[PDB]
Amino acid sequence: LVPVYIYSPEYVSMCDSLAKIPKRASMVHSLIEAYALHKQMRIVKPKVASMEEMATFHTDAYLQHLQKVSQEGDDDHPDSIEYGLGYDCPATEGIFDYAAAIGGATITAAQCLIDGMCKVAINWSGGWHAAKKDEASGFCYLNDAVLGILRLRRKFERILYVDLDLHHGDGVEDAFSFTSKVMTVSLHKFSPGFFPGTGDVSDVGLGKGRYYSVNVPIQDGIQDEKYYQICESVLKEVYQAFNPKAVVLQLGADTIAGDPMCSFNMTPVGIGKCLKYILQWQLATLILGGGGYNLANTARCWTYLTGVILGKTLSSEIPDHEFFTAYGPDYVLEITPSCRPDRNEPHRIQQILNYIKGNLKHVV
Amino acid sequence: LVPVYIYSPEYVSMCDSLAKIPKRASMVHSLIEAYALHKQMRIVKPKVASMEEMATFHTDAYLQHLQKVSQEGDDDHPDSIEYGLGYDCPATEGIFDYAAAIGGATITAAQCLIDGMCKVAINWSGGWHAAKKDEASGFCYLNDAVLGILRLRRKFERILYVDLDLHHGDGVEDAFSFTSKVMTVSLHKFSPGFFPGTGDVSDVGLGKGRYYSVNVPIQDGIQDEKYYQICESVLKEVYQAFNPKAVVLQLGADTIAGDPMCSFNMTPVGIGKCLKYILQWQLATLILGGGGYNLANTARCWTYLTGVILGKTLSSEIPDHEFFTAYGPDYVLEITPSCRPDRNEPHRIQQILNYIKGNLKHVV
Amino acid sequence: LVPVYIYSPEYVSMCDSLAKIPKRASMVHSLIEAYALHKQMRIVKPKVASMEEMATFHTDAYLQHLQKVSQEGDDDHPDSIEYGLGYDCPATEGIFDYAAAIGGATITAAQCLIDGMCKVAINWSGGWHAAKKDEASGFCYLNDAVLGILRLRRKFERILYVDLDLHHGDGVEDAFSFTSKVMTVSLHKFSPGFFPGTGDVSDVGLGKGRYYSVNVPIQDGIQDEKYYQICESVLKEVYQAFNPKAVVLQLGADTIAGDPMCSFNMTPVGIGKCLKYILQWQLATLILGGGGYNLANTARCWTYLTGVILGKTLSSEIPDHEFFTAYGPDYVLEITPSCRPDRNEPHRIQQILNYIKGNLKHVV
Amino acid sequence: LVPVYIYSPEYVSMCDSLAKIPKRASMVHSLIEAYALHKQMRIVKPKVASMEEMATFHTDAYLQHLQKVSQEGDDDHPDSIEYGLGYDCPATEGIFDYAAAIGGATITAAQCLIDGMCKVAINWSGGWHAAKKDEASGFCYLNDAVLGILRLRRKFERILYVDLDLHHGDGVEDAFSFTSKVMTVSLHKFSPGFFPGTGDVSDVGLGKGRYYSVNVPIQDGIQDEKYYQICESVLKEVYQAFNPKAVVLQLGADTIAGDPMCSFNMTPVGIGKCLKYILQWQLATLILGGGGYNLANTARCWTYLTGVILGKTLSSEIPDHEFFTAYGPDYVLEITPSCRPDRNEPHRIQQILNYIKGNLKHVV
Amino acid sequence: RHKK
Amino acid sequence: RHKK
Amino acid sequence: RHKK
Amino acid sequence: RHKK
Ligand SMILES: *Nc1ccc2c(C)cc(=O)oc2c1
Ligand SMILES: *Nc1ccc2c(C)cc(=O)oc2c1
Ligand SMILES: *Nc1ccc2c(C)cc(=O)oc2c1
Ligand SMILES: *Nc1ccc2c(C)cc(=O)oc2c1
Ligand SMILES: [K+]
Ligand SMILES: [K+]
Ligand SMILES: [K+]
Ligand SMILES: [K+]
Ligand SMILES: [K+]
Ligand SMILES: [K+]
Ligand SMILES: [K+]
Ligand SMILES: [K+]
Ligand SMILES: [Zn+2]
Ligand SMILES: [Zn+2]
Ligand SMILES: [Zn+2]
Ligand SMILES: [Zn+2]
Ligand SMILES: [Zn+2]
Ligand SMILES: [Zn+2]
């Protein structure tokens, strides 16, 4: 019954190497350990994904390319652009190994859920929801989330994927847009010019998967209360109509106030309520991380959320640890919302919640 | 009579190495060259800044540290955090050399203006306006803009610094907040949570420098027309009151639609009108780059602006070149505004323009 | 519940040595002792601050320099100017030791508050609010106030710093401008040309610390009544919104009529009402001195205020003691306001009190 | 024809030692020399005043005391307070020698005027107008101005003493209050609480000296134009009624904007016009310095005024010299007025000018 | 294609 | 302090 | 007396 | 910068 925590000194070390989020993995684990939360979880060393496992979603052409440029970090290969490598996804050397490590980590987590070893499995270094079968995207080289869902499909009939990252979980939605066995629900910022550009409330999936994709477009400045209202309202309807047997939850912390992307204005507490609502379902749940570009805040958030998973209330004072100075000058766990407008007009949110409730009536 | 273009294969190669903007320098030069604009300018190889020149603004402690961690890229030094190194400014190896190269490049540009070798000198790889005397900040390790201004002070009485980057030019404003010989004018996004957090219309400089700092806080979604109105209105008043003898202009392209920061909604044309207004003053002008996180767009913008400086109108079709594949899949030079709201309420803009006009009445 | 009085013959002797205020420490203690007030307080010998304690705010570079020039009073060192040493802060020999003694004294006071040894700790020789982490300023070589606040942070969540000195408490405000755990409130003269030149009502702190800095700019000639109205109005709002757990109060007497700076026109009684209002909060309070260039008046003021702290009413006649001849022409404790104008227009004060009240609504 | 400049390396070195103005003498001479103005004047080494010469005004008791405490800097002598030594006038060791050096310097200057060696003699280190016959006051230990005037009395029938220092020239006015052979004219700040507290327009001298003392009380914020109007108006009347044969002019630079006393808002140019008006009289003129607590500005002012005396126009750029870094960040010679109110109501100035014009009608 |  |  |  |  005790939560599984996917961890390994070598794993964290590899994650610390990702271009867009250096050292973040260490800070996250470090703060979690500093709060002694790892002592209340079952630590499981992750296995690296095999070429075969990764190939259950990603094409051989793409995988071969990734592995090739990963050799010595060839960031000048002429075919990389077609495979999504570039500014957002540089071909840093060893990247294939890191991607395989992250994919393996999420797969290990799903396997633990399948083996009844736990009801909740955590992989804070996962959540790279933007990767396509044959293309890297949005700091994502491999879609571990998809790999995890595929693995869970071996035992569970219906998987509910909930993406609370700031960005649309397009990669995952994509992978299952034609499936009715996996439903994807994503809350994200939707505004012309904002990556990835997809995920409007009108996007509901294709073919047999029509209506099995849910998108909640949100504007800048949303805070804890309104956000939870939206999330709860949508999740209540989804649960009722889809009746999932397992859940994969992505919790990108780039929605938290203080993030350099400065879009949403959430605090770990608001995301916590969403987490609690999903956990009260008592289903096998695979917890993933994702975005989060204010490193200290991301660690603050996932540490707090780990506490929520453990039903513990953490001390407000950041305990001394390797990265203590990174929590100055207040040195506290709580995060305060920024003093800026919530651009979300109530009537629009209402409009969106209904359009969704309508779409869900078709799910039987 | 003909514009000076600071360029050197070795220089561009070094700039391509900056963490937050890999290859951008090459793409910019490459597109400029692909339009054959370099043939219409006087190419000047930049000199690297000496420890003495950099020390005219930066403290020895900071400079020593930068050079030390730059040796092998020590990103674990215990003192780096105090010197601003970290997430935004990683201690990538060789960084000291790149910073010195950029600083030298802007210094070389100013020297050219001083020697009457030209009326306009360009250093698209410069514009790192956030660096403090003893601290790295916002992707900036050395404040080349400040070094350039200091150099120009050897010959010109009053220098007008105009920062059109998306972010507040805090480093530069700082360096001269107590000076009345250098006036800083910055148009930028100002919103709680948005870096760097300074630059409100009420910030006007300190001591003898009071009223010699101008800040124009702007909200998301501003477009070409309204932006130019604001810029012209402010520059008209500043010119009249300060009567500059030389101008340093920062043109960070992170205000252009398509930038991942997705804040302003400008096109290179709008920025161009601002440029034209400054150029019609007929003063020694040092052109710098800056932010710009959509690499292709940044190259598009500065290439277009280089054309404006040369009084040429460029072909809409992107000529084939080394990074030709980077402008896919359309291949045109023009940029289109995103379909999102201009959050700038007219009465507030009016309110701001007036407070500024009032502040400037004190400049004599 | 008996006040702690930081005193030591050696300590007073060292403070008497400060360039800008020779013998002031002795006169203050002497008059306090002459009124037998020390008999009603718990006398605690101060400890000298360690290089480590001072380093919690001040940089090693600055500290090393101070200690170096302090050796034999090298007032010709080429680097001193960069470290703020000079006219206002001469490198008098032994200065490092005095600065360390004062810093230690305020730290000792905070420690007493922490150990529950008292509710009020006094260090009349402290209050050097202008010193920066790496720079001496305004007769201040070390910012004891900041060191004291930092020490109190070990036990109290929120510290309210109130600066009633004639000058803006820029050093302290600076140290905590990004902090929301420490709020700084400063009443001071604000007028172009008047040191330090900062502290306008629009200065409210930076980043996460936005709105946690309060500044009340005041003009010459203000007297007891209007001043208390302003102070009470601001402190009432601050207390309500910030709910401090401890308070550090700076009481520079350079606001008192008779001071050679001849700006404000206050009497110890007016400042006393402010003191009473803060004391009625029943919080741990660290009392500091500061400016005061009319030595006899400064002693008069702090002696009277010490009596206010002790709830005693002192005899109007200055008792005979070592410095009795310095209390001419009337040899009394009371101070009379000078016959000059109060340049503070009511509508402006109103305007300022409102901006502040508005700023404070954002503190939660 | 050529101006005499009282200078001596040993003299400047002694003046640099005065408590309230360390290094000021060197900065003044240094900047003057940096402008090569000394090459256009006749340099005369000053002689130290003899006990007899000083005794022509100062009492033996006071002189004996000064010399005694000056031995080793006894700042604890019980009689010092009665002799004015203390906070404003500390008994720094060697002070007697410095005072004697300054007194001698002004006496040497007057002797040069008497010997027809020149029409203008300069002693920028003189001007200590507050000293009384038996008491030190306002940073003045010996009244060199008085000694100079007494010396000039050997050859000239009527001496006009004009004091433009920020403070009332009470010491000098005092010395000659009963004399009709020496007329004192002082423009200064007059406000309750402001040192020395004397010098109201009603103070006109005593006994036979009635109406031979002129005082012009002025309020804060006065600028060049209004100040010159007042000065010219008063000097025109004085000249006409008193018809002086020699002039001693004190030019304390503590009236210049930027001075820490922040009272008047003058620029060296305004004082320059006053100087020019006095020089056009073609009389033997003894030029003295005085107050000035912004060292660099004081040097700027007296250097500029020396140029006015020499009929030269100095370069705006501060030439490189020993104290160059002291003129940063602008490094120019001109001084800018601070942005604050002129508290002088026109009708009051009018009122004062008339009362004076009335008093002067009695001078025949 | 967008930039993240 | 804000991150860029 | 007054202080300067 | 101002002097105190
Ligand atoms: N999409 C995206 C947005 C912003 C970025 C910065 C500021 C730096 C970087 O290296 O990659 C970025 C990618
Ligand atoms: N300030 C800032 C904002 C965003 C960033 C990303 C997305 C990546 C990175 O490496 O650095 C960033 C810095
Ligand atoms: N009269 C006077 C006024 C101000 C002073 C300061 C700030 C320092 C000092 O040493 O002496 C002063 C004397
Ligand atoms: N800021 C300041 C103002 C006045 C001063 C005097 C009169 C003397 C001194 O030694 O330092 C001062 C500093
Ligand atoms: K999402
Ligand atoms: K689906
Ligand atoms: K800008
Ligand atoms: K400035
Ligand atoms: K204050
Ligand atoms: K604060
Ligand atoms: K005067
Ligand atoms: K007289
Ligand atoms: Zn994201
Ligand atoms: Zn707010
Ligand atoms: Zn920018
Ligand atoms: Zn003060
Ligand atoms: Zn004076
Ligand atoms: Zn003004």
So where are chain C's domains? 1-364
Cβ burial, residue A345 (10 Å; 0-12/13-18/19+): exposed
Q: How was this structure determined?
A: X-ray
How far B99 CA sits from the closest chain C CA (Å)? Answer: 23
How far D295 CA sits from the closest chain H CA (Å)? Answer: 10
CA-based angle D240:D245:D249, to the nearest 5? 90
> Do the Cβ atoms of D214 and D185 come closer than 8 Å?
yes
Residue C106 tokens, joined: 């305020």
In sequence order, what are the beta bridge partners of B285?
B120, B247
Ligand 3: atom nearest CA of D19 is 10
Ligand 3 pocket test, candidate residues C20, C21, C139, C194, most atoms within 8 A of CB: C20
Residue with tokens 């008339």: D354
DSSP states of C32-63: HHHTT-GGGSEEEPPPPPPHHHHTTTS-HHHH
Q: Which long-range contacts (CB under 8 A, 24 or more apart) does A71-76 make?
A: A75/B22, A75/B23
**Which run of H or E residues covers position D237?**
helix D224-242
Resolution in A: 2.5
The SS3 of residue B54 is: helix
**CB C220 near ligand 4, within 6 Å:** no
Q: Which residues does chain C have within 8 Å of residue A330's beta carbon, measured at their own beta carbons?
A: 179-181, 208
In sequence order, what are the beta bridge partners of B129?
none
Residue C263 tokens, joined: 């700006």
| C206 touches B: beta carbon within 8 Å | yes
Report d(CA A256, CA A243) in Å as an integer.
30
Which of C56, C59, C63 is most worth mutating to test chain B (most B CB atoms within 10 A of its CB)?
C59
How far E3 CA sits from the closest chain B CA (Å)? Answer: 5
Ligand 2: atom nearest CA of F4 is 1
Alpha-helical (H) ranges within chain B are: 9-15, 24-34, 51-54, 60-70, 95-114, 144-152, 170-175, 224-242, 268-279, 295-309, 346-360
Q: Look at phi and psi of residue A32 and say left if phi exceeds 0, alpha if psi is from -120 to 50, else beta.
A: alpha
Phi, psi of A14 (to 5 degrees): -75, -40
Question: What's at C145, amino acid-wise?
Answer: A
CB contact (8 A) between residue D137 and residue G1? yes
> Distance of CA A155 to CAs A107, A174, A181, C297, Å?
13, 22, 12, 85
What is Dmax (Cα atoms) for chain A?
Answer: 54
Report d(CA B93, CA B91) in Å as an integer.
6
Report d(CA D319, CA D35) in Å as an integer.
7
* Ligand index nearest the alpha carbon of residue D259: 4
The SS3 of residue A288 is: strand
What do you get for the CA distance between the two ends of chain E, in Å?
10
Report d(CA D26, CA D343) in Å as an integer.
35
Neighbors of chain G with 3 or more C-beta pairs under 8 Å: C, D
> Do the Cβ atoms of C179 and A329 come closer than 8 Å?
yes
B/e letters for A94-107, b = 16+ CB within 10 Å, e = fewer, are: ebbebbbbbbbbbb
**C42-44 and C4-6: which strand pairing?**
parallel
CB contact (8 A) between residue B293 and residue E3? yes
Q: Which residues does chain C have within 8 Å of residue D195's beta carbon, measured at their own beta carbons?
A: 260, 262
| A75 touches B: beta carbon within 8 Å | yes
Report d(CA A138, CA A131) in Å as an integer.
7
> Do the Cβ atoms of C45 and C8 come closer than 8 Å?
yes
Neighbors of chain B with 3 or more C-beta pairs under 8 Å: A, C, D, E, F, H
**CB A293 near ligand 2, within 6 Å:** yes
Residue B40 tokens, joined: 């219409």
Return the CATH class of domain B1-364: alpha beta
| D197 touches G: beta carbon within 8 Å | yes
Phi, psi of D188 (to 5 degrees): -165, 170
Report d(CA B57, CA D155) in Å as an integer.
58
CA-based angle C53:C58:C60, to the nearest 5? 90
Report d(CA C247, CA C158) in Å as an integer.
9
The SS3 of residue A270 is: helix
Report d(CA B354, CA B347) in Å as an integer.
11
Report d(CA B61, CA B357) in Å as an integer.
40
Q: If you compute the radius of gyration of chain G from its CA atoms, what whole number of angstroms results? A: 4
> Do the Cβ atoms of B230 and B350 come closer than 8 Å?
no
Q: Which residues does chain A have within 8 Å of residue F2's beta carbon, measured at their own beta carbons?
A: 258, 260
Helix axes D95-114, D60-70, angle to 10 degrees: 130
Rounded to the nearest angstrom, the distance between the alpha carbon of D180 and the centre of ligand 2 is 81
Nearest to C183 by CA among C241, C120, C118, C109: C241
| H2 touches B: beta carbon within 8 Å | yes
The SS3 of residue D164 is: coil
Edge-to-edge strands, sheet with A213-218: A42-44, A4-6, A120-123, A284-288, A246-250, A159-163, A182-189, A213-218
The SS3 of residue D141 is: coil
How far C212 CA sits from the closest chain D CA (Å)? Answer: 28
> Distance of CA A142 to CAs A12, A56, A282, B291, D114, Å?
17, 11, 29, 29, 98
